[PDB]
Amino acid sequence: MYGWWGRILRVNLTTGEVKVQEYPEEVAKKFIGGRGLAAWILWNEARGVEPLSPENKLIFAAGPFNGLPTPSGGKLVVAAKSPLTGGYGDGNLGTMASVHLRRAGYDALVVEGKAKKPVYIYIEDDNVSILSAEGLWGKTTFETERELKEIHGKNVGVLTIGPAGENLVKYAVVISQEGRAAGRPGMGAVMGSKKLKAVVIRGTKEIPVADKEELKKLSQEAYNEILNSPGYPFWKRQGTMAAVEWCNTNYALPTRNFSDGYFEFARSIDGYTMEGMKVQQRGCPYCNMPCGNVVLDAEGQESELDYENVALLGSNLGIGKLNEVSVLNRIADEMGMDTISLGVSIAHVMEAVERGILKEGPTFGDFKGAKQLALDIAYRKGELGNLAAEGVKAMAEKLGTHDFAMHVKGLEVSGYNCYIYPAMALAYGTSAIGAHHKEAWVIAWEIGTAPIEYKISYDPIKAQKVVELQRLRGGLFEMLTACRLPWVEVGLSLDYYPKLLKAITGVTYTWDDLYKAADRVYSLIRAYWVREFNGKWDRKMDYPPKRWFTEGLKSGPHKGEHLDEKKYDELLSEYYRIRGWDERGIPKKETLKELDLDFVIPELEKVTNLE
Amino acid sequence: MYGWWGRILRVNLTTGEVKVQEYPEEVAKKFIGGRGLAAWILWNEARGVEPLSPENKLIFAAGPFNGLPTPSGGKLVVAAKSPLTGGYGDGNLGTMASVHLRRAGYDALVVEGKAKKPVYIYIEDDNVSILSAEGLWGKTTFETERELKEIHGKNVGVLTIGPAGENLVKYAVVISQEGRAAGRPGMGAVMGSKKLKAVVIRGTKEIPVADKEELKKLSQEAYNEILNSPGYPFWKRQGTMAAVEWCNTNYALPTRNFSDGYFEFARSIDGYTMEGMKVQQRGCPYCNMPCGNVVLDAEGQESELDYENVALLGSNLGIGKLNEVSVLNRIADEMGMDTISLGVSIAHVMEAVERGILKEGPTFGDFKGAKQLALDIAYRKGELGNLAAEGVKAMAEKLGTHDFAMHVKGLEVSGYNCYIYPAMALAYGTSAIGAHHKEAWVIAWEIGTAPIEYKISYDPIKAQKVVELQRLRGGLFEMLTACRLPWVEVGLSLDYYPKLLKAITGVTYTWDDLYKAADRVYSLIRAYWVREFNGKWDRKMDYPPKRWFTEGLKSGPHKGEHLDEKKYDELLSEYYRIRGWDERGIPKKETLKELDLDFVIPELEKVTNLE
Ligand code: SF4
Ligand code: SF4
């Protein structure tokens, strides 16, 4: 076997047992890695488990591209049954831990059980130990990684959780290298529930490559193509922050809990403003187009800015000064909580306060109040911090505020306001893990323009475009696993991927093979949700928030415009037709058989009727 | 088996293999623990090795008293073939590592081999790992322990080496809890030679004891006997520092490389001065008479003062301000170098400089110059610092200054100047590990008074006294292994010891059994020296420094007086007569047989003729 090790590191925190599981080359070829491998593991090992119980499996899954010098191939997938959504949950982050896990001889790391006290997992090739982290517990993510490196050396990959993870904030994430984050659906809370403070990894092994020279050649070509792309200069300057102006121009910038798609103060929180306050730039392993832009916040502290962070903690909160939004951003990284769900939870509180629903709490534009709430959420201080720490779905159940609860499947909607964007609304509605733009950022195509540089339509071809994008963004890139931005942003040819894959693994994958592996992952993931939800499931699970159907844009040429539910419903049926799912969004028996998921049928039938 | 576990933790840094060695209860009964067990291990496993080579064995040996709540029972022996003397070397320190090692299920820890890069050993009960210490290398002992606890928590025992150990200073030691030190004969250099930066230990097991109720009863009585002793109040005030005035009054205070036994500025570095500058008091585990007296030095830094540190870095260097001596003391602790050998080496340089033998270097009374040289020794910076880092024996050979090289067997003489004290000179001459007062502080008995509160003689009875004290101090207390101070200083009855040993192990030891066990250890150690010296050995190996014969006291009523060679030689023969050793200081065959050391005979016969 080349590329894949066929090895998965297993750590049981309850028993202290550490072992290496060998999985068949057939499974590796069939699921490829990252999310695929994770979905296979969770389907088999997390049936009916409580997300915060010792039985949940915390998975760190790499893929064949990882550990090797592949173009922006320093990504890693973190997965577990989600404490926020109750379904399959995952996330991705660039981190040296990805390079080291693979160079240490493993394709993935699976943590089960729960330690008796705070501990961290140490991995140096074949030497794996569960060590006491009593001294680290309570420290920020930044401080935890800094201290671990002060002991073991700079040459290690470190994954940590901060107080939000330790306190089981439902959208707590895993942090690496002060800025890289993974696991919006609460991977950080699953990590915290096991009393797992960090993971330190070092690898030195040579990963067996089927064609060393092709690999080295293809990689050099791709790097050069990136360096020579016309978008490279502007990408180097603004990175994802170029989307603030682009979204504002197109009425897609979430403003005041998604109330409007335009923000009057977007310029003072945009990419140009960011350029003027940038002090450093860093990136993920093996990437020659770094986009981790670091600024100084209002308190003079370094903060790494990404578009989503700014959109959800800036315009979405009615906060118009980038230096202030940057303080909130830093807090999220330090505490280890998702900037998106954090911002949407805060915005939800702000709307409830302005409406008189909540007697106390911050209002839109209130930076000091937003900062205090962010901190109270991470430390679960007071009734408000505790409520908001649960996310908008849970919070809305308690407050009767479902009308303005911006989420899909319990996962908070990200940085694109879709009052007039049917395809993007469908992307959020059908995202495998819950509302996220990860799997299909189709709004650009719907508009005809993109950040590096209108008539509302429900054409069934939009459902086809979303499935196509999900195959690449929610499948391929989450399985390799590698950054999708070189392709998305600078236009690196997708042809490099199946070639790099054969050069590495020696297996020839055609685009249809890849499209099929991605579809298998999608149906398996959906199957997981259906099974864990005990068959209680229908098409409404794939609907975007009610706000986009009952309210419209508040300003500009498109004022009053919104989504037509009837037409959205028809577009959803088209999505199901293309995926081979029934009108409830559940995979059909024939579809499962065709995707080599026969094993799913018996289990799903114990819970509902299949078609 | 009670008391002893009969288990030794084994760590091979070259191969990375960790295993547990079981040894018979008969060996445990025979050698008891600590130095006894260490001597057994070195005899069998450090045969013909280079002290700084991977084959040398670094031993951390505890005894049956350790890990249990025994009066001042938190001591630990650190042993290995010495890079300073070439013979058997060991030292002792109080440390929570002692409590933890034994509660983790081990009687001792033996480290062999050499790591490719800096590492530290982590022990938590049965979970043992070799971890990267690449970020730690180069840090002071204080900072190393502090950082390790910032990761693993406060409930651990830690042993570290500082830059002096890393740089292989010949008298580098192992440090714990910013003040406790062990291994004057270079144990820190052996540790540094293996690229072992630290040992972190945690133990939670219940150590099996034969009679828990009697152990509890005896310990409470002993603790109360200490509290209620007439010497307790003055001890709590001055600790070992009371010896500065006592030695000065009796012309035993090493002054200017032992040139005199009287120092004109002794009051300014004495116990009363120490009391006026004490800011804290620390101690070893399970001790109710803590003696780690912490003062602020001339630089406002904390420094724990012990008599020897002050005598050898103060009066011995012509430095009369305690705050300045405390700066040197702190450097010795931070760097991890023996204060005694450091001071004697610096003192040697000062005399050579003032005699014009050395053209560059500090002179007596030169604090600034002494500080710079101490730092240069730790970092092996320059010709002078590298030379002094070798110790006086090696340094004297190069400079041809043997006439004033104060050492015995290559270990520098400690804090008692013996121009007029034959028994104490015999104590230094016959000390099992080289010049040290550890095994027999007979000078107090020789004069008739003690710090806690004369006509020179060579009576044969003085050799008997030295043997008796060696049995207790170099044997019993190094085997239990427990602090000898409660007995020496406040008069704790020695009768508690055999009784406590019985309550713990279930085995009865009469005083004759203990004397025999101690004599067995003394002959096995002497046999190790002879064998490692390839048979090149004679009575002059047990001679005190030449200066005590060729010069006399420079002050007071005893001005001009010194030791007589012929008379000392007869006293030494009396010592051998009592020990059953021949006129070359080598154990006789019948003595070895009597002490159950038959196995030693064949090995000694390959290098010399036995009697
Ligand atoms: S483009 Fe940005 S997110 Fe992608 S690998 Fe490079 S630094 Fe990481
Ligand atoms: S008397 Fe001093 S050296 Fe002995 S155990 Fe107590 S604190 Fe340690």
mmCIF file of C-alpha atoms in Angstrom, chain B residues 125-282:
data_model
loop_
_atom_site.group_PDB
_atom_site.id
_atom_site.type_symbol
_atom_site.label_atom_id
_atom_site.label_comp_id
_atom_site.label_asym_id
_atom_site.label_seq_id
_atom_site.Cartn_x
_atom_site.Cartn_y
_atom_site.Cartn_z
ATOM 1 C CA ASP B 125 2.715 4.908 38.250
ATOM 2 C CA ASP B 126 2.938 2.263 35.478
ATOM 3 C CA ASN B 127 2.817 4.888 32.696
ATOM 4 C CA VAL B 128 6.488 5.723 31.835
ATOM 5 C CA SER B 129 7.733 7.649 28.797
ATOM 6 C CA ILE B 130 10.777 9.274 27.294
ATOM 7 C CA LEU B 131 9.701 12.740 26.140
ATOM 8 C CA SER B 132 11.366 15.479 24.152
ATOM 9 C CA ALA B 133 13.101 18.134 26.272
ATOM 10 C CA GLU B 134 14.446 20.049 23.261
ATOM 11 C CA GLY B 135 12.774 23.303 24.358
ATOM 12 C CA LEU B 136 14.167 22.901 27.894
ATOM 13 C CA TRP B 137 17.857 22.346 27.149
ATOM 14 C CA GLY B 138 19.919 25.325 28.274
ATOM 15 C CA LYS B 139 17.474 26.511 30.946
ATOM 16 C CA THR B 140 18.389 26.811 34.619
ATOM 17 C CA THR B 141 17.332 24.107 37.083
ATOM 18 C CA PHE B 142 14.764 26.513 38.611
ATOM 19 C CA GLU B 143 13.168 27.376 35.284
ATOM 20 C CA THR B 144 13.173 23.753 34.103
ATOM 21 C CA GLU B 145 11.234 22.511 37.141
ATOM 22 C CA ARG B 146 8.930 25.538 37.058
ATOM 23 C CA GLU B 147 8.038 24.979 33.403
ATOM 24 C CA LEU B 148 7.553 21.237 33.841
ATOM 25 C CA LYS B 149 5.141 21.874 36.700
ATOM 26 C CA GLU B 150 3.319 24.476 34.593
ATOM 27 C CA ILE B 151 2.467 21.542 32.314
ATOM 28 C CA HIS B 152 2.030 18.507 34.557
ATOM 29 C CA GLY B 153 0.794 20.155 37.748
ATOM 30 C CA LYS B 154 2.023 20.600 41.316
ATOM 31 C CA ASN B 155 1.613 16.960 42.483
ATOM 32 C CA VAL B 156 4.873 15.703 40.935
ATOM 33 C CA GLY B 157 8.493 15.344 42.062
ATOM 34 C CA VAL B 158 11.124 16.746 39.675
ATOM 35 C CA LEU B 159 14.868 16.202 39.287
ATOM 36 C CA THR B 160 16.807 18.440 36.822
ATOM 37 C CA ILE B 161 20.268 19.413 35.675
ATOM 38 C CA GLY B 162 21.285 22.951 34.747
ATOM 39 C CA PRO B 163 23.808 24.265 32.170
ATOM 40 C CA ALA B 164 26.705 22.852 34.256
ATOM 41 C CA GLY B 165 25.316 19.305 33.968
ATOM 42 C CA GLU B 166 24.604 19.801 30.255
ATOM 43 C CA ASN B 167 28.164 21.066 29.742
ATOM 44 C CA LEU B 168 29.593 18.141 31.708
ATOM 45 C CA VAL B 169 31.208 20.109 34.545
ATOM 46 C CA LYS B 170 32.911 17.345 36.575
ATOM 47 C CA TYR B 171 31.164 18.279 39.823
ATOM 48 C CA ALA B 172 27.772 18.995 38.236
ATOM 49 C CA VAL B 173 24.891 17.811 40.449
ATOM 50 C CA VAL B 174 21.171 16.991 40.230
ATOM 51 C CA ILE B 175 18.859 19.718 41.585
ATOM 52 C CA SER B 176 15.329 19.615 42.967
ATOM 53 C CA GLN B 177 12.982 22.282 44.402
ATOM 54 C CA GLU B 178 15.434 25.184 43.871
ATOM 55 C CA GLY B 179 17.905 24.219 46.563
ATOM 56 C CA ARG B 180 18.107 20.475 47.181
ATOM 57 C CA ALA B 181 21.221 18.976 45.539
ATOM 58 C CA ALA B 182 22.757 15.508 45.057
ATOM 59 C CA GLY B 183 25.819 13.918 43.572
ATOM 60 C CA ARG B 184 28.953 15.971 44.170
ATOM 61 C CA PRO B 185 31.026 13.337 42.247
ATOM 62 C CA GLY B 186 29.471 14.456 38.942
ATOM 63 C CA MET B 187 26.091 12.747 38.899
ATOM 64 C CA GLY B 188 24.791 15.806 37.076
ATOM 65 C CA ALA B 189 27.499 15.336 34.425
ATOM 66 C CA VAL B 190 26.502 11.685 33.974
ATOM 67 C CA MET B 191 22.889 12.839 33.615
ATOM 68 C CA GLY B 192 23.970 15.510 31.154
ATOM 69 C CA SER B 193 26.112 12.978 29.227
ATOM 70 C CA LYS B 194 22.958 11.007 28.419
ATOM 71 C CA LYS B 195 21.136 14.138 27.163
ATOM 72 C CA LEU B 196 18.695 13.638 30.100
ATOM 73 C CA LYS B 197 17.433 17.080 31.130
ATOM 74 C CA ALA B 198 14.997 16.018 33.849
ATOM 75 C CA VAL B 199 12.928 13.297 35.516
ATOM 76 C CA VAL B 200 9.279 14.036 36.424
ATOM 77 C CA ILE B 201 7.586 11.539 38.762
ATOM 78 C CA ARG B 202 4.094 10.960 40.179
ATOM 79 C CA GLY B 203 3.010 7.991 42.292
ATOM 80 C CA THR B 204 -0.378 7.152 43.793
ATOM 81 C CA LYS B 205 -0.097 3.523 44.936
ATOM 82 C CA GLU B 206 -0.315 2.310 48.483
ATOM 83 C CA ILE B 207 3.081 0.876 49.491
ATOM 84 C CA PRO B 208 2.542 -2.444 51.325
ATOM 85 C CA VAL B 209 3.699 -2.312 54.971
ATOM 86 C CA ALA B 210 3.908 -5.163 57.472
ATOM 87 C CA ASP B 211 2.597 -3.262 60.517
ATOM 88 C CA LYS B 212 0.748 -0.056 59.633
ATOM 89 C CA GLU B 213 -0.349 0.659 63.224
ATOM 90 C CA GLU B 214 3.198 0.383 64.599
ATOM 91 C CA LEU B 215 4.604 2.454 61.699
ATOM 92 C CA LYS B 216 2.040 5.183 62.530
ATOM 93 C CA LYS B 217 2.874 4.935 66.252
ATOM 94 C CA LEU B 218 6.641 5.121 65.784
ATOM 95 C CA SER B 219 6.500 8.002 63.331
ATOM 96 C CA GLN B 220 4.284 10.135 65.569
ATOM 97 C CA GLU B 221 6.600 9.520 68.536
ATOM 98 C CA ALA B 222 9.678 10.389 66.483
ATOM 99 C CA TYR B 223 8.067 13.599 65.137
ATOM 100 C CA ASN B 224 7.111 14.663 68.655
ATOM 101 C CA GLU B 225 10.581 13.797 69.995
ATOM 102 C CA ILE B 226 12.018 16.164 67.354
ATOM 103 C CA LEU B 227 9.547 18.955 68.215
ATOM 104 C CA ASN B 228 10.243 18.585 71.892
ATOM 105 C CA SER B 229 14.020 18.476 71.699
ATOM 106 C CA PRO B 230 16.118 21.158 73.459
ATOM 107 C CA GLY B 231 17.847 21.817 70.130
ATOM 108 C CA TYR B 232 14.687 22.403 68.093
ATOM 109 C CA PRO B 233 14.384 26.195 68.593
ATOM 110 C CA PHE B 234 17.968 27.052 67.640
ATOM 111 C CA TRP B 235 17.795 24.578 64.754
ATOM 112 C CA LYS B 236 14.675 26.259 63.326
ATOM 113 C CA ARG B 237 16.596 29.546 63.498
ATOM 114 C CA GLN B 238 20.016 28.724 62.023
ATOM 115 C CA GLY B 239 19.985 25.197 60.642
ATOM 116 C CA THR B 240 23.428 24.076 59.513
ATOM 117 C CA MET B 241 24.531 27.740 59.413
ATOM 118 C CA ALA B 242 25.322 27.576 63.144
ATOM 119 C CA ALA B 243 28.549 25.826 62.074
ATOM 120 C CA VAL B 244 30.219 28.982 60.705
ATOM 121 C CA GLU B 245 30.878 30.341 64.215
ATOM 122 C CA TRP B 246 31.540 26.930 65.642
ATOM 123 C CA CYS B 247 34.193 26.111 63.053
ATOM 124 C CA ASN B 248 35.789 29.565 63.303
ATOM 125 C CA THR B 249 36.014 29.256 67.105
ATOM 126 C CA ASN B 250 37.709 25.880 66.699
ATOM 127 C CA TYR B 251 40.032 26.778 63.802
ATOM 128 C CA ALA B 252 38.216 24.472 61.402
ATOM 129 C CA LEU B 253 36.680 27.099 59.077
ATOM 130 C CA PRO B 254 38.291 26.689 55.604
ATOM 131 C CA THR B 255 39.752 30.086 54.820
ATOM 132 C CA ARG B 256 41.511 31.053 51.554
ATOM 133 C CA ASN B 257 41.834 27.576 49.997
ATOM 134 C CA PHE B 258 42.227 26.020 53.471
ATOM 135 C CA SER B 259 45.276 28.180 54.172
ATOM 136 C CA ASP B 260 43.861 28.959 57.622
ATOM 137 C CA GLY B 261 41.092 27.670 59.883
ATOM 138 C CA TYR B 262 40.135 31.175 60.970
ATOM 139 C CA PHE B 263 38.415 33.956 59.011
ATOM 140 C CA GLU B 264 38.431 37.549 60.246
ATOM 141 C CA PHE B 265 35.090 38.317 58.599
ATOM 142 C CA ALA B 266 33.231 35.172 59.689
ATOM 143 C CA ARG B 267 30.568 37.105 61.630
ATOM 144 C CA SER B 268 29.418 38.711 58.387
ATOM 145 C CA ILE B 269 28.736 35.300 56.787
ATOM 146 C CA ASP B 270 27.460 33.521 59.912
ATOM 147 C CA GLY B 271 24.195 32.084 61.235
ATOM 148 C CA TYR B 272 23.104 35.301 62.975
ATOM 149 C CA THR B 273 23.665 37.298 59.786
ATOM 150 C CA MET B 274 21.682 34.634 57.915
ATOM 151 C CA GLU B 275 18.797 35.013 60.469
ATOM 152 C CA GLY B 276 18.700 38.764 59.827
ATOM 153 C CA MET B 277 18.266 38.169 56.095
ATOM 154 C CA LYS B 278 15.986 35.082 55.992
ATOM 155 C CA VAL B 279 12.751 35.498 54.009
ATOM 156 C CA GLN B 280 11.614 31.859 53.810
ATOM 157 C CA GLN B 281 12.181 28.342 55.140
ATOM 158 C CA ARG B 282 11.699 25.224 53.016
#
